[PDB]
Write a protein that binds this ligand. Structure first.
Ligand SMILES: CCCCCCCCCCCCCCCCCC(=O)OC[C@H](CO[C@@H]1O[C@H](CO[C@H]2O[C@H](CO)[C@H](O)[C@H](O)[C@H]2O)[C@H](O)[C@H](O)[C@H]1O)OC(=O)CCCCCCCCCCCCCCCCC
Ligand code: CLA
Ligand code: CLA
Ligand code: CLA
Ligand code: CLA
Ligand SMILES: CC(C)=CCC/C(C)=C/CC/C(C)=C/CC/C(C)=C/CC/C(C)=C/CC/C(C)=C/CC/C(C)=C\CC/C(C)=C/CC/C(C)=C/CC1=CC(=O)C(C)=C(C)C1=O
Ligand SMILES: CCCCCCCCCCCCCCCCCC(=O)OC[C@H](CO[C@@H]1O[C@H](CO)[C@H](O)[C@H](O)[C@H]1O)OC(=O)CCCCCCCCCCCCCCCCC
Ligand SMILES: CCCCCCCCCCCCCCCCCC(=O)OC[C@H](CO[C@@H]1O[C@H](CO)[C@H](O)[C@H](O)[C@H]1O)OC(=O)CCCCCCCCCCCCCCCCC
Ligand SMILES: CCCCCCCCCCCCCCCCCC(=O)OC[C@H](CO[C@@H]1O[C@H](CO)[C@H](O)[C@H](O)[C@H]1O)OC(=O)CCCCCCCCCCCCCCCCC
Ligand SMILES: CCCCCCCCCCCCCCCC(=O)OC[C@H](COP(=O)(O)OC[C@@H](O)CO)OC(=O)CCCCCCCCCCCCCCC
Ligand SMILES: CC1=C(\C=C/C(C)=C/C=C\C(C)=C\C=C/C=C(C)\C=C\C=C(C)\C=C\C2=C(C)CCCC2(C)C)C(C)(C)CCC1
Ligand SMILES: [Cl-]
Ligand SMILES: [Fe+3]
Lengths: 33, 334, 341, 39, 105, 42, 41, 37, 52, 35, 31, 66, 36, 78, 48, 32, 42
């Protein structure tokens, strides 16, 4: 269990950088339609 | 106007029913004596000592041998790759016991398709067109050189070549995969991707033409009667068959240039059979396939078998049982 | 408007990849079969199934790695993850061999979803349905070698395992134990596949060779727009060339491309008819006219009679290693060796 | 009542619950975004 | 001939194909221009050294090495060539025309 | 001096040949006789 | 030549989801297969 | 018992004969060795 | 090293023969004129008598 | 048996000298587009 | 006894090769 | 068109060609019965395959024994 | 200029294809499954 | 020609490399720790190269029962 | 197995009955990409 | 002067773009 | 329990029937197809 969150922690680091640059512009899409 | 130029303009004349050009001065008499010896020695040849161990193999129609068992048997291994014509025999039936019919067919057939390949160039010159159908026939000619000539050159005798028969080709393939591992060779691997891939693209391109035909025909009659031969316009929408296949995979995975599409039909099986014909000829000089026997070992050093070992237990079982009394020493041609 | 008519408007809309109503069956089932092979070739062993290490995790490359067939011990089981064999546990279900029936059932429901897709594109754009018909060859090999061949046999063990070298067992498995090559339905199939590889090579390299000088450049690939009315190649010259080189030649471009449909598919459908008969051991093994003769004449020999002895070499040497559940404990004196090796 | 029987009925719920998500996910994706002049 | 640049290449590719096929059969058969102490033994003489090293071993066990009575009725160790020379028996009778510097004495 | 084969298979091959061979020669000759009846002597 | 300066375009299309089904397992597995071969027995 | 309107003639050109004469013969070339056994 | 030198010297000079068949074809088709394709204004087959 | 070697080598040289003297007799002028 | 069947079938399919080349339906350009 | 004594008593059976029910009809009634038949077909497939071993149902050849 | 060239994104993605396939041939001569 | 943002005007954009010049390594690193922290052997049942054999089990492991294979594979490792 | 093909042929035939002689002249403008929102629907002519 | 380094300066495309040196003898000598 | 008859005579009867039977069906179908080509669609 404890090594599962060593694998998914770069995945959580990947989506955190993805939701930093897109979270202004992904809010534009869901409010548009 | 000369006595030769009047003959020289008949050979290179396109008015004949079959083109009889200057390569056809060599392939017509060589194939017709590779036909007349093949038809006679399939029916009424005597049994042939193929291995040179004085045990003849009876592969003609008189001696039993329904046609998924009969074969023009290869030469004797005591002869080897020595030149064995009729006049270097003491008698004609002594020539038949050592298997003289196999180099008389296969040196005339190989010289006949080499001048079929030049004749396929030659009509593309006198008709005024692009000439590279000789290049596309160089994939079967090399593959007929690989099993018939280059594998007897590398492996010694003419008995190692492919027997001219249906069950002889299945015996040639099992003995090959015993000693050369063609199934795990990465150039035969490309050839079956040009054989399955070529069979894919025949069933793919031939489908998309016949599924997008414009109806110059009625309902009850046949569809093929709507293409008048020698017409100017295309009989099928290339833009609709591209818009079909651009919806099937995605839009840019499909050639709406029909010349680059049709070149890809001439590139995928022809390069693949070029790589098969190399592989059998590089295995003729015993550069075999991949050998991952006993590669996976654990920490104690005990051998763990992989899937290449169960191929090898097949490869070893057809190794001990082929040529069942022709071996006297423990290693096969080592 | 509507509710069911709404979902038909969205699912059949024009996008980069097309979903369609077949995409509710194709796009999940193609994903878990193509992806389920790629995660068992990467990680999942076969050590408790066959005694074989076959994955990239335990030291195999792209050739010698597979999701292997489940067991003889299970025996025709569908092998669900929730099933009675491997109840709930994912790690046991990978170890029993249950990924093979995860792939071969999603593959058998994905090829339904792709052939329903080829019906759904050709109906929407307005074409004829001759691509779902030509795909019925590849359906009838997957439904008859991976499903109808092991279901008649003993278990899922004797099926082809999804891997590169594990198929190369199955070709030599049907040579030694079945004399597959002498089967005339397979010999109908070799002349369908090597005939289709001829027709793709000889038609593709004669319309790149009898084509009209439409452009002015040295390369000819630029001289074609898709929406041109005129023919991009000369049918009369290509008819003239093969009438004198070969002797026969096509005169119908419309019949020519149907012959490129019929020769691979009716070659692939005929060899599928034979391997249905190979599930029942209704094989074309031996010529009984020549086995009576070779027993009643100890100097009668043919390449057929040499092919039978090669099959008893394959079936007696591989049997201790291929089927380890049977416990074949053949000593070294009783298996058929030849002489000196 | 058998554990091989109750695992099948639990598979019918788990087949339903996970694959009601493309039933509703292809229903939210159309009532928020649809074609302009059609059915 | 044709007198152009694509022509003069094409004459030389057919000539280099003739030399490249010849240089293969040099490397597979010759052991004098391609000596065996550097390139290894050739295709024939590997198959003839095996018949030689078991002609030695069973002679060292006291057999008359001629009159072998091999299994097919022919010579096991020593045999007769089709032209009538005394050659090595077995499968290696196809390589009977071997000239190799360790057996030519 | 002999090869014991299946005696009904001479009927399986020759009736297996000459019944569908005669089916195609039935269909071909009437197809050209319909062309000869329509083009000529119309 | 220049970037698309002001034209509107959706970012989470279905072509985004169709690629990331085959790309995000790929860059996970490459790197898992790369780490398998430094493993000594 | 009126005259039928739905009757239609059958065509077969010479190409379709030569394929059918080739096919029925080659299937008899192929299967004769197995029928004779 | 004989088994590499002989195997690769089928790989090179067989392909070196294939490009000779490419270039003996192309040089005699470029010197004659029909290297970019069949001339549509006069193709030579349409000015020939047919086969039979 | 020697008489066949005299007869084959008559025939093999006959089609070879038709081959060599055939392609020497102005073969690239046998095209279309004027000669 | 049965080799007469194989020689008849192989020559009899070699005549259909002969008749399809020289006695073919002659393709003439749609006048 | 010949009208006989048998074709006159079978006349209202071959009468209403193309006389459908409007709209969606009994299609949600049909989709329940198609689902229940498919749910029936997965049960007896798993009974035969011994993935659904139920009490007092033995799928051995010894079921019809003494 | 706010843009990467198309040939540059295929170049550094092209070296890594040779880079990953370079490690797959090295890893077949080392470690587990290399007959060592 | 479909109405959405084109492919090659995404790959060339500077936001695309500002978002995942890191998450193409961050999936490569997450794949690396899946096969190096012993998780790839455990959740897929693959044996470690010292866990092929066992001091109590020198032979090869093969499943014998079908329904009690959960009880057998538990008693086949350790 | 052979009846699986003929069902797949006849199910291809009973749906595609009007294109059995071949496709018409209405196909060319309804196929090319991005013209319509819903594929095969000429009432969705996206535009402007 | 200078000649032939494009598609529509010689006819050959880039994959054939080694055969723009047939009628160019100076670059061909530096190519050999 | 058996009757030993001449084994080539199965080929003498059935090819003796089906070769001249197929000769008359070849001639009859083309005779009516020539009538159908001349009377109808002239
Ligand atoms: C057409 C289909 C085949 C018709 C053959 C037939 O007609 O035959 C169909 C049946 C066959 O009859 C069976 O016939 C048998 C007798 O034949 C055998 O017994 C005889 C005496 O030993 C001969 O040996 C003979 O060769 C051998 O076949 C027994 O008498 C059975 O009782 C009887 O059912 O004819 C009948 O029953 C009567 C219906 C006709
Ligand atoms: C000289 C080359 C040559 C020739 C002529 C053949 C010919 C044949 N092979 Mg064969 N084969 C070859 C090389 C060759 N093979 C090689 C190199 C291999 C790999 C080792 C094989 C492997 C192989 C397998 C595995 C099988 C065949 C089969 C066949 C038969 C049908 C082929 C088919 O459907 O393909 C497509 C055919 C065409 C596109 C054109 C038709 C060509 C005809 C059939 C050739 C007839 C040749 C015959 C001798 C008659 C010649 C007439 C002449 C004397 C006038 C045919 C007898 C199959 C078989 O057993 O069927 C009996 C089969 O299963 N072959
Ligand atoms: C009192 C109630 C009752 C009882 C006791 C039975 C009893 C039975 N029914 Mg039954 N039935 C009933 C009511 C009942 N029925 C009613 C009310 C209906 C609705 C009209 C049906 C409709 C029905 C059908 C349609 C079938 C049965 C079958 C059966 C038999 C199952 C055992 C068997 O051999 O199946 C063995 C058969 C199966 C398990 C079927 C599995 C088929 C799978 C799902 C699909 C296989 C083909 C598919 C295309 C895959 C091809 C791929 C290939 C490569 C594998 C058994 C005799 C089956 C039968 O008689 O088969 C012998 C059957 O097919 N029943
Ligand atoms: C080893 C083989 C080889 C050789 C000797 C050449 C040589 C040549 N090619 Mg060429 N070419 C090759 C392979 C080769 N090519 C391949 C494989 C292709 C297919 C992709 C092409 C495609 C091609 C095209 C499209 C063109 C040429 C052209 C040319 C000529 C001029 C090059 C130039 O102006 O660039 C100058 C080069 C540079 C400014 C940088 C190159 C890198 C330098 C040399 C660094 C290396 C330094 C080294 C370490 C010391 C030159 C004679 C051109 C031509 O016809 O003449 C104008 C032309 O347009 N070739
Ligand atoms: C001395 C040998 C020689 C010479 C000088 C030429 C010269 C030429 N050829 Mg030619 N050719 C040759 C041998 C030769 N050829 C051989 C051996 C073949 C058979 C394979 C061909 C087949 C051939 C074709 C089919 C064509 C030419 C063309 C051309 C012209 C342009 C070449 C070009 O742009 O390629 C640019 C180079 C490339 C695009 C790269 C190709 C790379 C190949 C596919 C892979 C090579 C694999 C190699 C063994 C190992 C590589 C290692 C790998 C890890 C990277 C030029 C006049 C063209 C032409 O007609 O122009 C007039 C043309 O269309 N050639
Ligand atoms: C004494 C003797 C003879 C001894 C030999 C004994 C012996 C070896 C006997 C065996 C012989 C034999 C025939 C065995 C066959 C085996 C067997 C069982 C066959 C069954 C037949 C079979 C597979 C039926 C299923 C249907 C099917 C899949 C058929 C495949 C068809 C096939 C094999 C080949 C067709 C492919 C082919 C040759 C195409 C050539 C096309 C071509 C050049 C067309 C001309 C042309 C080309 C163009 O490109 C253009 C543009 C135009 C315009 C044009 O016109
Ligand atoms: C858990 C998920 C399981 C999978 C679910 C999906 C299964 C597959 C369903 C999709 C099948 C698509 C059929 C397309 C055939 C080609 C016809 C065509 O041209 O395209 C589809 C086209 C679309 O029609 C188009 O639209 C125009 C109006 O918009 C016109 O109607 C035109 O006809 C046409 O251009 O025609 C059809 O709709 C044909 C209807 C055929 C329907 C058959 C019955 C439905 C299938 C039932 C399957 C049941 C599965 C569940 C069982 C539960 C138990
Ligand atoms: C979680 C559980 C799993 C759930 C997953 C989903 C499962 C879905 C299963 C059912 C799949 C149905 C596929 C239908 C394919 C054809 C659709 C189509 O394109 O037709 C689209 C066309 C549209 O054409 C319409 O025509 C009408 C007049 O006929 C009207 O004029 C409409 O305005 C017009 O739009 O036809 C239809 O309206 C629907 C016809 C088919 C109806 C369903 C068939 C029966 C299905 C039963 C399933 C029971 C379960
Ligand atoms: C297709 C996906 C293959 C991915 C893969 O598993 O490659 C993994 C393998 C390498 O796999 C490596 O093998 C080594 C052996 O030295 C190690 O022992 C390990 O098993 C593993 O790291 O890559 C290759 O062998 C080359 C890939 C060629 C792919 C061609 C695809 C053609 C279609
Ligand atoms: C020595 C010089 C070279 C001579 C080579 C001679 C080889 C001649 C081969 C002719 C084959 C003709 C077959 C009839 C078939 C025939 O003639 O059909 C005629 C047909 C004509 O096509 P069309 O353009 O006229 O089509 C229009 C009609 O179909 C419209 O409905 O040609 C073809 O379909 C393509 C032929 C493919 C190639 C034929 C198959 C090759 C396999 C042959 C089988 C060999 C068996 C050997 C057993 C012993
Ligand atoms: C079964 C399972 C699952 C899952 C599935 C999935 C999700 C999968 C995925 C998968 C993925 C997602 C991926 C994988 C893999 C991939 C890969 C492995 C890729 C790639 C590689 C390659 C491709 C190689 C090589 C190359 C390159 C690099 C490029 C160029 C070419 C070549 C080929 C050379 C589930 C959940 C259902 C549940 C149960 C279990
Ligand atoms: Cl030996
Ligand atoms: Fe086409």
């Amino acid at each position: 269990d404890t090594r599962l969150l060593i694998v998914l922690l770069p995945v959580l680091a990947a989506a955190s950088w993805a939701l930093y640059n897109i979270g202004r512009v992904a809010l534009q899409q869901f409010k548009r339609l | 106007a000369s006595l030769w130029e009047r003959f020289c303009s008949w050979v290179t004349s396109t008015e004949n029913r079959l083109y009889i050009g200057w390569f056809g001065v060599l392939m017509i008499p060589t194939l017709l004596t590779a036909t007349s010896v093949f038809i006679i020695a399939f029916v009424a040849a005597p049994p042939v000592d193929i291995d040179g161990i004085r045990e003849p193999v009876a592969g003609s129609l008189l001696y039993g041998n329904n046609i998924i068992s009969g074969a023009v048997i290869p030469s004797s291994a005591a002869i080897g790759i020595h030149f064995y014509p009729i006049w270097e025999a003491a008698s004609l039936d002594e020539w038949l016991y050592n298997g003289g019919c196999y180099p008389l067919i296969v040196l005339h057939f190989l010289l006949g398709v080499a001048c079929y390949m030049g004749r396929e160039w030659e009509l593309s010159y006198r008709l005024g067109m692009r000439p590279w159908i000789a290049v596309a026939f160089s994939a079967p000619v090399a593959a007929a050189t690989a099993v018939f000539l280059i594998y007897p050159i590398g492996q010694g005798s003419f008995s190692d070549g492919m027997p001219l028969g249906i069950s002889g080709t299945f015996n040639f393939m099992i003995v090959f995969q015993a000693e050369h591992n063609i199934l795990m060779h990465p150039f035969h691997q490309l050839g079956v991707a040009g054989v399955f891939g070529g069979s894919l693209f025949s069933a793919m391109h031939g489908s998309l033409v016949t599924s997008s035909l414009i109806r110059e025909t009625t309902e009850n009659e046949s569809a093929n009667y709507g293409y008048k031969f020698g017409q100017e316009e295309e009989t099928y929408n290339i833009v609709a068959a591209h818009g079909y296949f651009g919806r099937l995979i995605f839009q840019y995975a499909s050639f709406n240039n029909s010349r680059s599409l049709h070149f890809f039909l001439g590139l995928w099986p022809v390069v693949g059979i070029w790589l098969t014909s190399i592989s059998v000829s590089t295995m003729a000089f015993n550069l075999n396939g991949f050998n991952f026997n006993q590669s996976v070992v654990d920490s104690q050093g005990r051998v763990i078998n992989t899937w290449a070992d169960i191929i090898n237990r097949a490869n070893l079982g057809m190794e001990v049982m082929h040529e069942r009394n022709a071996h006297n020493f423990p290693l096969d041609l080592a | 408007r509507g509710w069911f008519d709404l979902i038909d408007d969205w699912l059949k809309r024009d996008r980069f990849v097309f979903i369609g109503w077949s995409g509710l069956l194709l796009l999940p089932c193609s994903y878990l079969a193509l992806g389920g092979w790629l995660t068992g070739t990467t990680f999942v062993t076969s050590w408790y199934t066959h005694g074989l290490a076959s994955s990239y995790l335990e030291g195999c490359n792209f050739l010698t790695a597979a999701v292997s067939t489940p067991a003889n011990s299970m025996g025709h089981s569908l092998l669900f993850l929730w099933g009675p064999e491997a109840q709930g546990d994912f790690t046991r279900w990978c170890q029993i061999g249950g990924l093979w029936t995860f792939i071969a059932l999603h593959g058998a429901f994905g090829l339904i979803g792709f052939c329903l897709r080829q019906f759904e594109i050709a109906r929407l754009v307005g074409l004829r349905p001759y691509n779902a018909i030509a795909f019925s060859g590849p359906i009838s090999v997957f439904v008859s070698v991976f499903l109808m061949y092991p279901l008649g046999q003993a278990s899922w063990f004797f099926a082809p395992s999804f891997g590169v070298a594990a198929i190369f067992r199955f070709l030599l498995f049907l040579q030694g134990f079945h004399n597959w090559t002498l089967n005339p339905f397979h010999m109908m199939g070799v002349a369908g596949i090597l005939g289709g590889a001829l027709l793709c090579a000889i038609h593709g390299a004669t319309v790149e060779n009898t084509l009209f000088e439409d452009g002015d450049a040295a390369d000819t690939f630029r001289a074609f727009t898709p929406t041109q009315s005129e023919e991009t190649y000369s049918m009369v010259t290509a008819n003239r060339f093969w009438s004198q080189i070969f002797g026969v030649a096509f005169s119908n471009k419309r019949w020519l491309h149907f012959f490129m449909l019929f020769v691979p598919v009716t070659g692939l459908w005929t060899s599928s008819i034979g391997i249905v008969g190979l599930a029942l051991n209704l094989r074309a093994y031996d010529f009984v006219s020549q086995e009576l003769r070779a027993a009643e004449d100890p100097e009668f020999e043919t390449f057929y009679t040499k092919n039978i002895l090669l099959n008893e070499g394959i079936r007696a040497w591989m049997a201790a290693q291929d089927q380890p559940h049977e416990n074949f404990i053949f000593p070294e004196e009783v298996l058929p060796r030849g002489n000196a090796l | 009542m058998t554990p091989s029987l109750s695992s099948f009925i639990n598979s019918l719920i788990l087949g339903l619950v996970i694959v009601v998500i493309p039933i509703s996910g292809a229903l939210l994706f159309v009532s928020q975004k649809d074609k302009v002049t059609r059915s | 001939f044709v007198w152009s640049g694509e022509a003069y290449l094409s004459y030389s590719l057919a000539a280099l194909a003739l030399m490249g096929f010849t240089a293969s059969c040099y490397a597979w058969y010759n052991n004098t221009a391609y000596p065996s102490e550097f390139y290894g033994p050739t295709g024939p003489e590997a198959s003839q050294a095996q018949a030689f090293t078991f002609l030695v071993r069973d002679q060292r066990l006291g057999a008359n090495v001629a009159s072998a009575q091999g299994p097919t009725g022919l010579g096991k160790y020593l045999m007769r060539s089709p032209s009538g020379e005394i050659i090595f028996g077995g499968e290696t009778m196809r390589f009977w025309d071997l000239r190799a510097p360790w057996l030519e004495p | 001096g002999g090869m014991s084969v299946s005696f009904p298979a001479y009927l399986a091959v020759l009736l297996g040949t000459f019944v569908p061979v005669a089916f195609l020669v039935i269909l071909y000759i009437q197809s050209e006789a319909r062309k000869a009846g329509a083009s000529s002597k119309s | 030549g220049n970037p698309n300066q002001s034209v509107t375009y959706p970012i989470f299309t279905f072509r985004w989801l169709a690629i990331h089904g085959i790309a995000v397992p790929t860059v996970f597995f490459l790197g898992a297969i790369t780490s398998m071969q430094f493993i000594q027995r | 018992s009126n005259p039928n309107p739905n009757k239609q003639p059958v065509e077969l050109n010479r190409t379709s004969l030569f394929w059918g004469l080739l096919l029925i013969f080659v299937l008899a070339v192929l299967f004769s060795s197995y029928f004779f056994n | 090293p004989r088994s590499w030198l002989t195997s690769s010297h089928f790989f090179l000079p067989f392909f070196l023969f294939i490009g000779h068949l490419w270039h003996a074809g192309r040089a005699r088709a470029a010197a004659a004129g029909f290297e970019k394709g069949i001339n549509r204004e006069n193709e030579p087959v349409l000015f020939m008598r047919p086969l039979d | 048996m020697f008489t066949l070697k005299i007869f084959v080598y008559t025939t093999v040289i006959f089609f070879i000298s038709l081959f060599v003297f055939g392609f020497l007799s102005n073969d690239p002028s046998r095209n279309p587009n004027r000669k | 006894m049965e080799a007469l069947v194989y020689v008849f079938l192989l020559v009899g399919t070699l005549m259909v090769i002969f008749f399809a080349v020289f006695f073919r339906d002659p393709p003439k350009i749609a006048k | 068109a010949l009208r006989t004594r048998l074709g006159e008593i079978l006349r209202p059976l071959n009468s209403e060609y193309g006389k459908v029910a409007p709209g969606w009809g009994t299609t949600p009634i049909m989709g329940v019965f198609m689902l229940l038949f498919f749910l029936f077909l997965l049960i007896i497939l798993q009974i035969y395959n011994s993935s659904l071993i139920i009490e007092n149902v033995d799928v051995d050849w010894t079921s019809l024994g003494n | 200029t706010g843009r990467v060239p198309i040939w540059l994104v295929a170049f550094v993605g092209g070296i890594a294809v040779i880079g990953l396939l370079g490690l797959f041939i090295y890893g077949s001569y080392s470690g587990v499954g290399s007959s060592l | 020609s479909t109405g959405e943002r084109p492919f090659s005007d995404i790959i060339t954009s500077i936001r695309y490399w500002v978002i995942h010049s890191i998450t193409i390594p961050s999936l490569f690193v997450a794949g690396w720790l899946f096969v190096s922290t012993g998780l790839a052997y455990d959740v897929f049942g693959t044996p470690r190269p010292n866990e092929y054999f066992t001091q109590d089990r020198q032979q090869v492991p093969l499943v014998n029962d079908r329904f009690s294979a959960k009880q057998e594979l538990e008693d086949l490792t350790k | 197995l052979l009846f699986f093909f003929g069902h797949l042929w006849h199910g291809s035939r009973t749906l595609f009955r009007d294109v059995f002689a071949g496709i018409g002249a209405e196909v060319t403008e309804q196929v090319e990409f991005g013209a319509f929102a819903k594929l095969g629907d000429r009432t969705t002519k996206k535009q402007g | 002067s200078a000649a032939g380094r494009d598609i529509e300066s010689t006819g050959f495309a880039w994959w054939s773009g080694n055969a723009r040196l047939i009628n160019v003898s100076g670059k061909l000598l530096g190519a050999h």
